[PDB]
Design a protein around this motif. Structure first.
Motif, PDB file in Angstrom:
ATOM      1  N   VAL A  26       0.823  -1.203   0.000  1.00  0.00           N
ATOM      2  CA  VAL A  26       0.000   0.000   0.000  1.00  0.00           C
ATOM      3  C   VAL A  26       0.861   1.258   0.000  1.00  0.00           C
ATOM      4  N   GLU A  27       2.072   1.141   0.532  1.00  0.00           N
ATOM      5  CA  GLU A  27       2.996   2.267   0.596  1.00  0.00           C
ATOM      6  C   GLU A  27       3.589   2.569  -0.775  1.00  0.00           C
ATOM      7  N   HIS A  28       3.336   1.684  -1.733  1.00  0.00           N
ATOM      8  CA  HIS A  28       3.845   1.855  -3.089  1.00  0.00           C
ATOM      9  C   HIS A  28       2.742   2.313  -4.037  1.00  0.00           C
ATOM     10  N   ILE A  29       1.573   2.609  -3.479  1.00  0.00           N
ATOM     11  CA  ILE A  29       0.436   3.059  -4.274  1.00  0.00           C
ATOM     12  C   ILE A  29       0.673   4.484  -4.758  1.00  0.00           C
ATOM     13  N   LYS A  30       0.567   4.683  -6.068  1.00  0.00           N
ATOM     14  CA  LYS A  30       0.894   5.966  -6.674  1.00  0.00           C
ATOM     15  C   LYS A  30      -0.255   6.552  -7.486  1.00  0.00           C
ATOM     16  N   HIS A  31       0.025   7.674  -8.138  1.00  0.00           N
ATOM     17  CA  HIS A  31      -0.910   8.301  -9.060  1.00  0.00           C
ATOM     18  C   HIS A  31      -0.183   8.663 -10.349  1.00  0.00           C
ATOM     19  N   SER A  32      -0.209   7.744 -11.312  1.00  0.00           N
ATOM     20  CA  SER A  32       0.521   7.910 -12.564  1.00  0.00           C
ATOM     21  C   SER A  32       0.025   9.107 -13.367  1.00  0.00           C
ATOM     22  N   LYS A  33       0.960   9.943 -13.807  1.00  0.00           N
ATOM     23  CA  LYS A  33       0.627  11.118 -14.604  1.00  0.00           C
ATOM     24  C   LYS A  33       0.745  10.821 -16.093  1.00  0.00           C
TER      25      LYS A  33
END
Lengths: 61, 296, 169, 159
Positions: free
Chosen positions: D92-99
């Motif tokens: 969960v700490e690697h959850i991102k928001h790809s641009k």
RNA sequence: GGUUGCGGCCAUAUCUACCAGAAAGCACCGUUUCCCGUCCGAUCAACUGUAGUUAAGCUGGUAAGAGCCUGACCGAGUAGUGUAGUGGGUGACCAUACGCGAAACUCAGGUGCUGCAAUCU
RNA sequence: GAGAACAGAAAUCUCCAGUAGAACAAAAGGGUAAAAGCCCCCUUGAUUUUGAUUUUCAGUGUGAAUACAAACCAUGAAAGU
RNA sequence: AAGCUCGUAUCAGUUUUAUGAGGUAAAGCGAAUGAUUAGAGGUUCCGGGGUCGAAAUGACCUUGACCUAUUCUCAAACUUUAAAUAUGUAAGAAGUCCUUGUUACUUAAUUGAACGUGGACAUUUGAAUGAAGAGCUUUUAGUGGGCCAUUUUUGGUAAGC
């Protein structure tokens, strides 16, 4: 809370001494020698009146 | 105080301010997190919240839609609506907020599709009950709030604002543990004492100890009431006839207005100063190398 | 200017240090009660000392804070004791002040030999109207510079009403 | 004697993160990701519950589900030659928001109005922009800027 | 234009030392019969709008201040790194041709921005 | 740092300055301030059934973490977990 | 080496887009390790040992731990956590816009989202477009003992590894 008496026991800390200063005295002299100020301890025997433990500690110190 | 300590210049590097709404104090992310922001189990939903801010016990009600960019105010209910009806003073109590909750449940309801639906009771006696919505169709409406501070206490005009709205058709799953007349010991409710804070029974109660006991503050306290001939049972008729003005015309008529944003666009820069360009104020710039900072 | 930036007393706080718990403390407490009408508050030792004979959390001192009129009485009443002479210290740079008295009898109050004789101190914290800004829950602020209580300003206040003398350099 | 048994072991990785910071940026548990958001094994600093080899770095599979943990991805283990099996993702700490699914859809999708204008206009459409063709013969001037002949300074012998 | 409640925006705001504030809109002060919260009515809660007040806070102005940000052929077509290549050299190093290309120091300018609702000569 | 009746550089009370060397379960290090923490008051969702996903894996064993619906609880004025 | 199944059909030693991941830089010993440093001046029935009074709380020293009064504030490579410069994944008939259905999610509200059908964007149909073929399965042999140079990095107390 002798349960948590033995609690700080199995533990309890220098804050455990604070909790202790907040048989029974078995666990008493137990954590007694544990934390082992020594003045607190003479007064300990004080509030008191275990034996073996105290004797051994005195002989070693 | 940096005239004694005097910090260095390398000390200011890891400096980080909070919200604009934090220093001045306007927004919090521990209550709003469960007010505006929400899980995507509802997705796009116009979650209308009721903003309440009692300054000097002044009736202020605001309705702002939940939008991440560009907030649009649906409606607003201030204290400049009761003198319009006929209520001069005595609008800083719980009964005023009780009538406000009913007033906002008719004004906003007017633009909320229909106005005939969502009512309840009009007798007003003070009883904890649930509004029976129309089966199959009109679901029970739920109004959201928005405050921030204000300690959790009993007998609040702010907290009791939902109680006045509860009798307006707005179905909110609330409790009865905080009513003016509730016992902290047992779990029994007393609607008898509750009625006293509706028709202003507690207000006239204090007046009984002014014509025999506290005579020193008799001429001071309660002065505006004598101007409108309010001392007997006329105070009860004020809050009673206040409900008739609610169903009258909740369209919110504007005040005097008189010249809005046009003629009143020139008043500030008539006595104060402004940050004029340095190209025009060269007389002050060249003066710095004269005697201001050029040693005589 | 000045209107509304008067100089009320925020509060008077009488305080009794007693290097022990027990009778001698509940008696210090009894003193502060009957003297304030308010039931006073106990303070525990912060750490243990030994040369002072105290242990962490011992209950070592009582005190009581007193506000409005009642404050001024006890102020003046013990201020008497001090012959209306404080000193140029005694006043904080933030404009409050205090003094000690020993013998809590030198200001009304009988003797009672089952109570004993205790000191008679207490600090006086001063402020002006609008202190609330720095103290309420919402929109908590700090008070403007030209509104803050100071030493100069409070001494001058004391020297005036009371008429008392300042002393030292 | 050792450090295992009840609750111990693993003394190589022992916490958090940083970077931006505002929590993890309070918008992860709020918004629900769909098809396109990749949860690259990011934020492993404190999420090494069975840390893989250093070789696994860069490969990616196909997202099919979004939940508490992370999405489904693949890592063509290019060991020796071809790529092995396996899928991965991240905690969960690697959850991102790809641009990557943002900027690309604000330049190509933004030019959708230029596409619906050819039949009622006359060809010349599509956003196939020209890269950088070499400039031809342009028209310059001389009047207004007198040329100047410069020369490198005589570097002498000095320390 | 200014002001209040509710957002976006995270040193283009906040701190030290000053000045300004006719109206509207805040805050402080006053009250203790009811509710909540203390050792203390300071904070919080409740009640009221009649009486000291531009004193504090906020805003604005002032500033070769401090800190931070933007711009320039000023520093600097720098330093470092990559590819290719039989130049010197024992090692540690120093160049040419063809792309890309650091920070700090110097100079200059600005001194919060914005949407909705409500109030206001 | 600046005060005081019992009372010294340490104890009790009050005030000012102050963007975190702290607090936040083991040994340790960034977080965050009308606190995510501490204290008081109010407590048993730290327990069971039925799915799915992340790291390792052969969409494993074991262990751990994140995110819903359907029973059964607690706290709160409302909106929630 | 010996086969099967297909076609606008597998992409790239050169250029743009910066979302994840890491444990080399900084800090602390005030509950974890270590080279947590170096002295002087007191008080003795009874902290533990002698000589001298038949004795009685008669008296007088030395040799080890403290208190008061000072100095340093613990090496970067013990552990955990945590940066700049940097590199994958993203490239549309598989997707988007206008008109329109349903349900057990959301809402006061056939509103949004998710899930269908039909039509148009038709040769600039989603940078540029070089390129004597692609995917899957099975089996056998050899090999599990080499050296040197250039560039980059660590270590590097002569000659030198």
């Amino acid at each position: 809370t002798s349960q948590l008496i033995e609690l700080v026991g199995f533990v309890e800390l220098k804050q455990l001494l604070l909790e202790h200063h907040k048989e029974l005295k078995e666990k008493i002299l137990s954590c007694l020698t544990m934390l082992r100020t020594a003045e607190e301890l003479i007064q300990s025997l004080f509030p008191l009146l275990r034996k073996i433990i105290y004797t051994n500690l005195i002989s070693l110190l | 105080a940096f005239q004694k300590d005097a910090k260095s210049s390398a000390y200011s590097s890891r400096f980080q301010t909070p919200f604009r709404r934090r220093r001045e104090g306007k927004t919090d992310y521990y209550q709003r997190k469960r007010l505006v922001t929400q899980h995507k189990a509802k997705y796009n939903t116009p979650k209308y919240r009721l903003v309440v801010r009692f300054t000097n016990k002044d009736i202020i009600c605001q309705i702002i839609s939940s939008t991440i960019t560009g907030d649009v105010v649906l409606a607003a209910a201030y204290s400049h609506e009761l003198p319009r009806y006929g209520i001069t003073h005595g609008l800083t109590n719980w009964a005023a907020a009780y009538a406000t909750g009913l007033l906002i449940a008719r004004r906003t309801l007017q633009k909320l599709g229909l106005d005939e639906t969502y009512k309840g009771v009009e007798e007003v006696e003070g009883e904890y009950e649930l509004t029976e919505a129309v089966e199959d169709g009109p679901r029970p409406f739920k109004v959201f709030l928005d405050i921030g501070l204000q300690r959790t206490t009993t007998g609040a005009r702010v907290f009791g604002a939902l109680k006045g709205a509860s009798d307006g058709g707005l179905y909110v799953p609330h409790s009865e543990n905080r009513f003016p007349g509730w016992d902290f010991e047992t779990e029994e409710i007393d609607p008898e004492l509750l009625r006293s804070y509706i028709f202003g029974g507690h207000v006239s109660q204090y007046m009984e100890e002014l014509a025999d006991d506290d005579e020193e503050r008799f001429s001071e306290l309660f002065k505006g009431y004598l101007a409108d001939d309010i001392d007997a049972d006329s105070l009860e008729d004020i809050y009673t006839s206040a409900h008739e003005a609610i169903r009258a015309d909740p369209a919110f008529k504007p005040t005097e207005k008189k010249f809005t944003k046009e003629q009143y666009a020139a008043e500030s820069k008539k006595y104060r100063q402004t940050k004029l360009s340095k190209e025009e104020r060269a007389a002050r710039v060249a003066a710095k190398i004269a005697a201001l900072a050029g040693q005589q | 200017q000045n209107p509304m930036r008067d100089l009320k007393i925020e509060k008077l706080v009488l305080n009794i240090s007693v290097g022990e718990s027990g009778d001698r403390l509940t008696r210090a407490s009894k003193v502060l009660e009957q003297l304030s009408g308010q039931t006073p508050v106990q303070s525990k030792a912060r750490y243990t000392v030994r040369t002072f004979g105290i242990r962490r959390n011992e209950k070592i001192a009582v005190h009581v804070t007193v506000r409005g009129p009642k404050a001024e009485e006890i102020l003046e009443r013990g201020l008497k004791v001090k012959e209306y002479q404080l000193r140029d210290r005694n006043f904080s740079a933030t404009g409050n002040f205090g003094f000690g008295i020993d013998e809590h009898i030198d200001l009304g109050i009988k003797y009672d030999p089952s109570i004993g004789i205790f000191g008679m101190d207490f600090y006086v914290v001063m402020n002006r109207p609008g202190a609330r800004v720095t103290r309420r829950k919402r929109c908590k602020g700090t008070v403007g510079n030209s509104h803050k209580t100071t030493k100069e300003d409070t001494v001058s206040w004391f020297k005036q009403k009371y008429d008392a003398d300042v002393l030292d350099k | 004697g050792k450090s295992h048994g009840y609750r111990s072991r693993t003394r190589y990785m022992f916490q958090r993160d940083f970077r931006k910071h505002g929590a993890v940026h309070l918008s992860t548990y709020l918004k629900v990701y769909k098809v396109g958001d990749i949860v690259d094994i990011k934020a492993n600093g404190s999420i090494q519950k069975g840390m893989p080899h250093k070789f696994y770095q860069g490969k990616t599979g196909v997202v099919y589900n979004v939940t508490k943990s992370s999405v489904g991805v693949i890592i063509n283990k290019m060991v020796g030659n071809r790529y092995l099996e396996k899928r991965l993702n991240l905690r969960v700490e690697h959850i991102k928001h790809s641009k990557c699914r943002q900027e690309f859809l604000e330049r190509v999708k933004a030019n959708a109005a230029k596409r619906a204008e050819a039949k009622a206009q006359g060809v010349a459409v599509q956003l196939k922009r020209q890269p950088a063709q070499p400039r031809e013969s342009r028209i310059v001037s001389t009047e207004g800027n007198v040329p100047q002949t410069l020369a490198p300074v005589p570097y002498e012998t000095f320390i």
